Amino acid sequence: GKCRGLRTARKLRSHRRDQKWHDKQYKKAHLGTALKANPFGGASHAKGIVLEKVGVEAKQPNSAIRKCVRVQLIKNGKKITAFVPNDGCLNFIEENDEVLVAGFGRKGHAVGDIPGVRFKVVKVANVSLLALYKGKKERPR
Amino acid sequence: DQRHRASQLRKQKKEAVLAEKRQLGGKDGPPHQVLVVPLHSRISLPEAMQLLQGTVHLNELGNTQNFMLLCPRLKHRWFFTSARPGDLHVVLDMAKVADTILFLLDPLEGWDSTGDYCLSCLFAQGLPTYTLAVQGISGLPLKKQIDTRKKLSKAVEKRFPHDKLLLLDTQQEAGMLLRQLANQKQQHLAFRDRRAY
Amino acid sequence: PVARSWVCRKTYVTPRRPFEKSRLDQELKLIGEYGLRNKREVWRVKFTLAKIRKAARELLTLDEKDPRRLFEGNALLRRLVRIGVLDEGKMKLDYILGLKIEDFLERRLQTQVFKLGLAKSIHHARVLIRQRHIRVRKQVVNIPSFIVRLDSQKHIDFSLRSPYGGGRPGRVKRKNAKKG
Amino acid sequence: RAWVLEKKERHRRQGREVRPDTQYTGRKRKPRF
Amino acid sequence: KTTGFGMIYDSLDYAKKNEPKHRLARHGLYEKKKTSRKQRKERKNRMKKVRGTAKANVG
RNA sequence: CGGGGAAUCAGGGUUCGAUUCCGGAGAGGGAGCCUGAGAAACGGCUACCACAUCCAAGGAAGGCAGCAGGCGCGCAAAUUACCCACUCCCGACCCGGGGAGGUAGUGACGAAAAAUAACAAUACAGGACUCUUUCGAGGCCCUGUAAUUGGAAUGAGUCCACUUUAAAUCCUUUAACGAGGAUCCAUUGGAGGGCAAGUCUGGUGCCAAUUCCAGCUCCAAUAGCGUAUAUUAAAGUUGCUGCAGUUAAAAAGCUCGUAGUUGGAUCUCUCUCGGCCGAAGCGUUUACUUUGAAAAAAUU
Known part of the structure; x- marks a missing residue:
C-alpha cells in the first residue's frame, strides 16, 4: 500500500512527480514536442496560401466523396489539408488565396465521419465563409 | 543555439521583404501607379487631384490628366491617374495595371449607386492595395464631425470590414496620405504577376 | 499608472445544467407574476440569496460566544429586517436558512407599486416605473429592481411632475386637444 | 445515414423510447460553420 | 435639486490674488495667451539650436 | 523576472501572475569611463561588432523595450488629438516647466443598470360561484387569445438654453417637435439517434430504400449568441484527504542487504546579593499546542 509515515513527504512528493508523466495528457502539454509538431504552433488559428483542390473519400459504413483543399501555412511552411463546409462553399476559393484556418473541433482528432482531415476553413480573402454563403458580403479577388 | 537559429531565420526573412519593398517606387523599379476613383457625385475630383500635387510633371490627354510625381526626400516615384466610375473600359483597364487604388468617399453617405456599381466590378476583377479617403469632413459642423464619422464607418463596414478611413482636407493630411500609400504592403494579384505587362 | 479603479463583480451565476424541465418551470413561474425581463433577473436574486446563505452557515459553525459571530450575526440580521424580508421576532441565524427567492422578489419597487394600488398589473407597474411616473420620498426612480426598505414603504408617492401626479398633461393629450 | 439506423435499432433492443423511423431519420439539417 | 460650491471674498483685490486663472476668466477679469502647446514646443526646440541674442x- | 496577487473551489488541491503596487534587470550586442552626493547613466561620452542616414566623396552624424506613428511579424492589440485645470515632481521659484499625469478619439476584453410596449371596450375559449337532479340561465366574477377598435403614457431621435469642463463632449436638468404594421420591423444557435425541442414541405439522383440543396414548425439564451484554442471543475481518469495490480492496464524468479520510512510494555525548581519579591544556574535538549509582539497598501 501507500506509506503513511509522518516524515514521508519526500517520497510521497517524488513519486507523484514521476507518476504524472504516465498520463499522456500531462506529457503532451509538458514535454513540448507535442507543440513542435503541431502545425499551428500552439495557436488557435493560422493563415495560409491555397495550393490546390482535392477530394477525400469517406469511411466504409457511410460512403461519400468530400472535397478539401491543400493549404500551406505562412508562419512555419507546413502543409495541412483543410475542410470546407460544403461543396457550395468551394465556389469562393481559388488557388493562391489567403485563408484563415481553425481546427475541426476535437482538439486534434479527426472527424467522426471522414478521416484524415483535422482543420476547417473560417475565412477566405479576409472575409468569412458564413457571410459569403449567406450573401451578406462579396469577396475581392 | 535556439536564439541564434531564430535570429538567422529573421535575418533571412527581413532581407527578402526589404528587397520587395524597395523594388517598387524606388530608383530601381517602375513608378508606383496610383488610381484615384471617386465614389460619389459630391466629391470634387479636381479639388482632390490638386492636393496630391516634390516636383510635378503634368501629362494630360483629351479629357483626363495623369501626372508624374517625384519625391526626392521621401525616395519614392509616383504616377497618379484618375478615373470617373461608370465608364467601364476607363476604370477597369487602368485598375488592372494600378498598384494602389485610392477611394474617395462622401462624408454624409457611403457612396452613390454608381459607386456601388463600380465597386462590384472592381471586386470581381481583382483589387490591388486600396486606401480610403474622406474628402469633405471639414464642411460639416465641428460638433457632428465625431458623430458623422461614427455613422460613416458603419456604412463602409458592409464592404470594407476593418479598414481605417483617412482625410483629404489640407496639405498636411495630403502629405500623411502619400506616406501611407508609399509604405504599405502590396496585394500581389495572381494573373498579372505571371505575365509581362 | 492611472487614477482608475478596476474592481468589478458579476451579480449572477449561470446554472450547470442548462436544460432541465424542473428548473425551467420554476424560473418561468417567477418571471410570470413578478414581470421580469429575462432569466438573469431570476439568477441575480438567486445569487444574492446564496451569498447571504453562505455568510449564515459560516457564522453558524463558530461557537455561540465568538465575538465575530455576535457582531456579524447581528449585522446580517439587521440588514435583512431593514429591507423587510425578516420578521422582527425572527432575529436568529437559524431563520435565515428558511428564506426563499420569493421573499426578496416581493420587495422590489415593481412589486410594491402593484401591491400599493398604483398600477393595474405587474407589467403595468414596470412600464410606470421606467417612464418616470413613480417616486420614493422625494426622489424619482427608474429602476424596477430598486429594493424598498421598510422606512420607504409608506412613502412611495406618485411623481408631482407626472400627468398621473401633479397634473401637467402629456404629449398625446396636448397634441389631441390641438386638433379641435 | 445507415449508421444512424443500426444505432436506433440497438436502442430499440434496449427497450428505451425511440422516435419512429421515417424519411427524416438521417439527414444533415444545414451546413455547419 | 442642485448641489454646488461657492465662495465670497472680502474684496475684489483679494479675489484677484487667491483665485485660479480660469475662474477669473469666466468673469472677464483675466485673459489668457492664445498659443497652443505645439507652437511653444517647436519654437522652444528651434532656439536651442541657436546660441546668443539671435534666440x-x-x- | 520574483512577490503581493487572479481563476476555480464542500474539503484537500490544480492552473495562472508579460501587465498599473513592491523589489530587480536592461536600453541594438559587448566593454571602458567623465561629471557628480548618488550612474559603469545611454532622450551622457569613447571604442569594437551588427545595421543604417547626409555628402561637393575630403568628412559629419545615429540609437522610439518614452508619447503618438509607420514597416515587419503575425490568429492577435487604438489618435502622428487638447491641457498643465486635477494629483504630484523639478528649479534660483507663490509665477516657469512636465506625452509624468489629466481630458477627449477608437474600444461587444470584460463588468453593472436597462427599452423594443401598457391599459380600456367588443368577440370567442377556459376556470370558479348563485339558482337548477341535470341540460342550462347568468348586464356573476376571473383569466387568456384577436387578419377588432379606442385614445392615454413615454422614450430612442432632431434641436435652443442652462449645467459640465482648462475649453469642450457625455451624463443630469429642461423649451419645441417626436409612435399603430407604435415598418422606430431582435438576433444567434440547436432539434426529426440520447439532455429543451418534428408522425413536416418542395426540388436532386441509386437498385420501396436512398447523395446534395432550399424552406416550414418547435426549443433555448437574449442586446446578445455561436466557433477554434489554452486551462479549471466534472476526474475518487494522478487518489495527502482518496484509486488500483487473480481472471480487465499492472506483484519484482528467490533470498540477504546499506540509506530512508516505521518501531512492544514501563517512570505522579532553586542558591546568593538588594527593595513577600527583584538579579542569577535556570530546569537535559527538542518536536507539539496555546498566547503575545512584529508584519505595505491595493485585492479578498
Whole structure:
C-alpha cells in the first residue's frame, strides 16, 4: 500500500512527480514536442496560401466523396489539408488565396465521419465563409 | 543555439521583404501607379487631384490628366491617374495595371449607386492595395464631425470590414496620405504577376 | 499608472445544467407574476440569496460566544429586517436558512407599486416605473429592481411632475386637444 | 445515414423510447460553420 | 435639486490674488495667451539650436 | 523576472501572475569611463561588432523595450488629438516647466443598470360561484387569445438654453417637435439517434430504400449568441484527504542487504546579593499546542 509515515513527504512528493508523466495528457502539454509538431504552433488559428483542390473519400459504413483543399501555412511552411463546409462553399476559393484556418473541433482528432482531415476553413480573402454563403458580403479577388 | 537559429531565420526573412519593398517606387523599379476613383457625385475630383500635387510633371490627354510625381526626400516615384466610375473600359483597364487604388468617399453617405456599381466590378476583377479617403469632413459642423464619422464607418463596414478611413482636407493630411500609400504592403494579384505587362 | 479603479463583480451565476424541465418551470413561474425581463433577473436574486446563505452557515459553525459571530450575526440580521424580508421576532441565524427567492422578489419597487394600488398589473407597474411616473420620498426612480426598505414603504408617492401626479398633461393629450 | 439506423435499432433492443423511423431519420439539417 | 460650491471674498483685490486663472476668466477679469502647446514646443526646440541674442530672432 | 496577487473551489488541491503596487534587470550586442552626493547613466561620452542616414566623396552624424506613428511579424492589440485645470515632481521659484499625469478619439476584453410596449371596450375559449337532479340561465366574477377598435403614457431621435469642463463632449436638468404594421420591423444557435425541442414541405439522383440543396414548425439564451484554442471543475481518469495490480492496464524468479520510512510494555525548581519579591544556574535538549509582539497598501 501507500506509506503513511509522518516524515514521508519526500517520497510521497517524488513519486507523484514521476507518476504524472504516465498520463499522456500531462506529457503532451509538458514535454513540448507535442507543440513542435503541431502545425499551428500552439495557436488557435493560422493563415495560409491555397495550393490546390482535392477530394477525400469517406469511411466504409457511410460512403461519400468530400472535397478539401491543400493549404500551406505562412508562419512555419507546413502543409495541412483543410475542410470546407460544403461543396457550395468551394465556389469562393481559388488557388493562391489567403485563408484563415481553425481546427475541426476535437482538439486534434479527426472527424467522426471522414478521416484524415483535422482543420476547417473560417475565412477566405479576409472575409468569412458564413457571410459569403449567406450573401451578406462579396469577396475581392 | 535556439536564439541564434531564430535570429538567422529573421535575418533571412527581413532581407527578402526589404528587397520587395524597395523594388517598387524606388530608383530601381517602375513608378508606383496610383488610381484615384471617386465614389460619389459630391466629391470634387479636381479639388482632390490638386492636393496630391516634390516636383510635378503634368501629362494630360483629351479629357483626363495623369501626372508624374517625384519625391526626392521621401525616395519614392509616383504616377497618379484618375478615373470617373461608370465608364467601364476607363476604370477597369487602368485598375488592372494600378498598384494602389485610392477611394474617395462622401462624408454624409457611403457612396452613390454608381459607386456601388463600380465597386462590384472592381471586386470581381481583382483589387490591388486600396486606401480610403474622406474628402469633405471639414464642411460639416465641428460638433457632428465625431458623430458623422461614427455613422460613416458603419456604412463602409458592409464592404470594407476593418479598414481605417483617412482625410483629404489640407496639405498636411495630403502629405500623411502619400506616406501611407508609399509604405504599405502590396496585394500581389495572381494573373498579372505571371505575365509581362 | 492611472487614477482608475478596476474592481468589478458579476451579480449572477449561470446554472450547470442548462436544460432541465424542473428548473425551467420554476424560473418561468417567477418571471410570470413578478414581470421580469429575462432569466438573469431570476439568477441575480438567486445569487444574492446564496451569498447571504453562505455568510449564515459560516457564522453558524463558530461557537455561540465568538465575538465575530455576535457582531456579524447581528449585522446580517439587521440588514435583512431593514429591507423587510425578516420578521422582527425572527432575529436568529437559524431563520435565515428558511428564506426563499420569493421573499426578496416581493420587495422590489415593481412589486410594491402593484401591491400599493398604483398600477393595474405587474407589467403595468414596470412600464410606470421606467417612464418616470413613480417616486420614493422625494426622489424619482427608474429602476424596477430598486429594493424598498421598510422606512420607504409608506412613502412611495406618485411623481408631482407626472400627468398621473401633479397634473401637467402629456404629449398625446396636448397634441389631441390641438386638433379641435 | 445507415449508421444512424443500426444505432436506433440497438436502442430499440434496449427497450428505451425511440422516435419512429421515417424519411427524416438521417439527414444533415444545414451546413455547419 | 442642485448641489454646488461657492465662495465670497472680502474684496475684489483679494479675489484677484487667491483665485485660479480660469475662474477669473469666466468673469472677464483675466485673459489668457492664445498659443497652443505645439507652437511653444517647436519654437522652444528651434532656439536651442541657436546660441546668443539671435534666440530672439526665431520665427 | 520574483512577490503581493487572479481563476476555480464542500474539503484537500490544480492552473495562472508579460501587465498599473513592491523589489530587480536592461536600453541594438559587448566593454571602458567623465561629471557628480548618488550612474559603469545611454532622450551622457569613447571604442569594437551588427545595421543604417547626409555628402561637393575630403568628412559629419545615429540609437522610439518614452508619447503618438509607420514597416515587419503575425490568429492577435487604438489618435502622428487638447491641457498643465486635477494629483504630484523639478528649479534660483507663490509665477516657469512636465506625452509624468489629466481630458477627449477608437474600444461587444470584460463588468453593472436597462427599452423594443401598457391599459380600456367588443368577440370567442377556459376556470370558479348563485339558482337548477341535470341540460342550462347568468348586464356573476376571473383569466387568456384577436387578419377588432379606442385614445392615454413615454422614450430612442432632431434641436435652443442652462449645467459640465482648462475649453469642450457625455451624463443630469429642461423649451419645441417626436409612435399603430407604435415598418422606430431582435438576433444567434440547436432539434426529426440520447439532455429543451418534428408522425413536416418542395426540388436532386441509386437498385420501396436512398447523395446534395432550399424552406416550414418547435426549443433555448437574449442586446446578445455561436466557433477554434489554452486551462479549471466534472476526474475518487494522478487518489495527502482518496484509486488500483487473480481472471480487465499492472506483484519484482528467490533470498540477504546499506540509506530512508516505521518501531512492544514501563517512570505522579532553586542558591546568593538588594527593595513577600527583584538579579542569577535556570530546569537535559527538542518536536507539539496555546498566547503575545512584529508584519505595505491595493485585492479578498
